[PDB]
Every structure is written in C-alpha cells, then in structure tokens.
Write an enzyme that holds these catalytic residues in place. Structure first.
Site, PDB file in Angstrom:
ATOM      1  N   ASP A  69      21.280  78.218 -39.826  1.00  0.00           N
ATOM      2  CA  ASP A  69      22.590  78.447 -40.478  1.00  0.00           C
ATOM      3  C   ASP A  69      22.759  77.350 -41.516  1.00  0.00           C
ATOM      4  OD1 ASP A  69      23.202  76.358 -38.560  1.00  0.00           O
ATOM      5  OD2 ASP A  69      25.217  77.129 -38.276  1.00  0.00           O
ATOM      6  N   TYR A  71      23.922  74.124 -44.018  1.00  0.00           N
ATOM      7  CA  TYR A  71      24.279  72.737 -43.743  1.00  0.00           C
ATOM      8  C   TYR A  71      25.747  72.636 -43.372  1.00  0.00           C
ATOM      9  CZ  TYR A  71      19.894  71.043 -45.846  1.00  0.00           C
ATOM     10  OH  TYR A  71      18.571  70.733 -46.071  1.00  0.00           O
ATOM     11  N   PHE A  82      18.156  75.289 -46.672  1.00  0.00           N
ATOM     12  CA  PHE A  82      17.665  73.891 -46.770  1.00  0.00           C
ATOM     13  C   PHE A  82      17.849  73.264 -48.148  1.00  0.00           C
ATOM     14  CE2 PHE A  82      15.470  75.916 -43.244  1.00  0.00           C
ATOM     15  CZ  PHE A  82      15.883  75.086 -42.238  1.00  0.00           C
ATOM     16  N   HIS A 192      12.335  73.569 -35.336  1.00  0.00           N
ATOM     17  CA  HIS A 192      13.211  73.306 -36.481  1.00  0.00           C
ATOM     18  C   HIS A 192      12.976  71.882 -36.981  1.00  0.00           C
ATOM     19  CE1 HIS A 192      16.952  72.913 -38.712  1.00  0.00           C
ATOM     20  NE2 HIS A 192      17.026  74.269 -38.746  1.00  0.00           N
TER      21      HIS A 192
END
Ligand SMILES: O=C1CC(=O)NC(=O)N1
Ligand code: NA
Ligand code: NA
Length: 228
Positions: A69, A71, A82, A192
C-alpha cells in the site's frame, strides 16, 4: 475524481478496457474516499494520483512490481509504488533498501533521487495491492475494496498475448501469485523491503537481474533499470 469520472477519462485506453470488470468497484472506492474525508480522516496519495500506475500504457508493461500500500507519510506517496518526487530527501527507508539491492544486484551507483518514473516509462508497472492509506497508518485501507481492482489488473495483464514477469514484494503482494499461473507469466517473490522484513530475504534477492533473465528467456526485451 474516480467517483465522478469514467475509466476512459481516468486511465490510459488499454487500462480502461482491462479494468472494465471493476468499473463499478473503482466508483465505489471513490465513494469510500469521499466518506473518509466527510468523516474527518485523510488518505494518501492525493486523489488525482491514486490510479497513476494505470496512466502508463497497459500494452507496454513487461514487468509488474507489486507492493503492499502507499507510503504512510504525507509528501511521499505519488501513486507509483515505492516512488517519491525527485525533491524528496531523505528517502523512505523501504526505498533506501530497494536502492541498496539495486546497487548490489546491478552494480549501478546509487540513484540521484527517489523518482522511479523512468521505470514506469520503460514498461514497469509500479503497483500496490491496495491503492490508498490513512496517513501514519500502514495497511489501514486493507480489505476496503482495492484488492478486487488490483486482482483485475493482474488478471488482465496475465491474459494479454505477451510475456510478463511479476516481482511480488511482501505478503499482501504474494496473494496475486494464483492469478500468474499461465505459461506466459512468471512470478518472483520475496519479503518486503521495509526494515521490518528486508533481512528475511529481500536483501540478496537480485530481483532486477532475475526479471531480465526471465524476460530474455521468454523472447522479450529486458528492462533498462538504470536510474540517473
Ligand atoms: O511504504 C510503502 C510504499 C509503497 O508504495 N509500497 C509499499 O509496499 N510500501
Ligand atoms: Na507490511
Ligand atoms: Na504486505
């Protein structure tokens, strides 16, 4: 606004057709966001950027990167997973970890800034499994309706008469793996790049070079990963 305007206005032409099965769902998500603001809660990224990954051509995608999801800090999320605006410093910690691995895998110097638009302009879809988040609260919009949207996006990419490589970062992204089974598609998965999970196998994963060795093996052009 995704409540008010149709997919033909919001996203690129290929994407608007790919997402036709979730047209109503996207309008429902616009109503969700409107209800959040009415209630006094905020969301990121900005409304006009929520669907930004789908503004690069569907037909041109060769690699999909999928995170969790957006930031959680105001000023970071831009609607491309990202990525940050080219004037953001310091980089978010997940991005610093990504760039760490990018240098280790590819041998390139550290990028000048955190803007990943060159990847998006070169056929990399920068997706998150969920497209909005409440500020300061990662995963706060999990289970609110975005998953159907991003499931549809992956299914549609997978069905194209074209090779596809998916890079699935973290647990929520991994839930797309069942929709990549077909012979034209291949998925890389790792933990992740967040500090909470990177040391469990993100570092050392070599996703960029492996995606390119997969594309070349399928008769597709590798990605030029090099950032300025
Ligand atoms: O913090 C973040 C940013 C992003 O776009 N994607 C993620 O999975 N994590
Ligand atoms: Na997470
Ligand atoms: Na996750």
């Amino acid at each position: 606004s995704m409540t008010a305007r149709p997919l033909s206005e919001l996203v690129e032409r290929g994407w608007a057709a790919a997402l036709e099965p979730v047209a109503d769902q996207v309008a429902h998500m616009g109503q969700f966001l409107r209800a959040e603001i009415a209630a006094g809660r905020r969301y990121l990224p900005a409304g006009s950027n929520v669907l930004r990954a789908f503004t690069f051509p569907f037909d041109n995608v060769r690699v999909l990167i999928v995170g969790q999801d957006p930031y959680p800090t105001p000023g970071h999320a831009v609607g491309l997973s990202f990525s940050v605006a080219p004037d953001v410093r310091p980089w978010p910690r997940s991005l610093a970890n990504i760039f760490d691995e990018y240098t280790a895998d590819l041998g390139y110097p550290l990028p000048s800034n955190g803007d990943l638009t060159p990847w998006a302009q070169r056929g990399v879809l920068l997706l998150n499994r969920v497209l909005t988040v409440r500020p300061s609260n990662p995963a706060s919009h999990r289970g609110k309706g975005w998953e159907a949207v991003t499931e549809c996006a992956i299914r549609a990419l997978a069905a194209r008469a074209a090779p596809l490589v998916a890079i699935l970062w973290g647990r929520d992204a991994s839930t797309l793996k069942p929709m990549l089974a077909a012979g034209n598609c291949v998925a890389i998965e790792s933990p992740h790049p967040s500090p909470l999970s990177a040391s469990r196998g993100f570092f050392g994963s070599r996703p960029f070079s492996r995606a390119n060795e997969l594309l070349v093996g399928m008769g597709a052009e590798p990605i030029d990963w090099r950032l300025p």
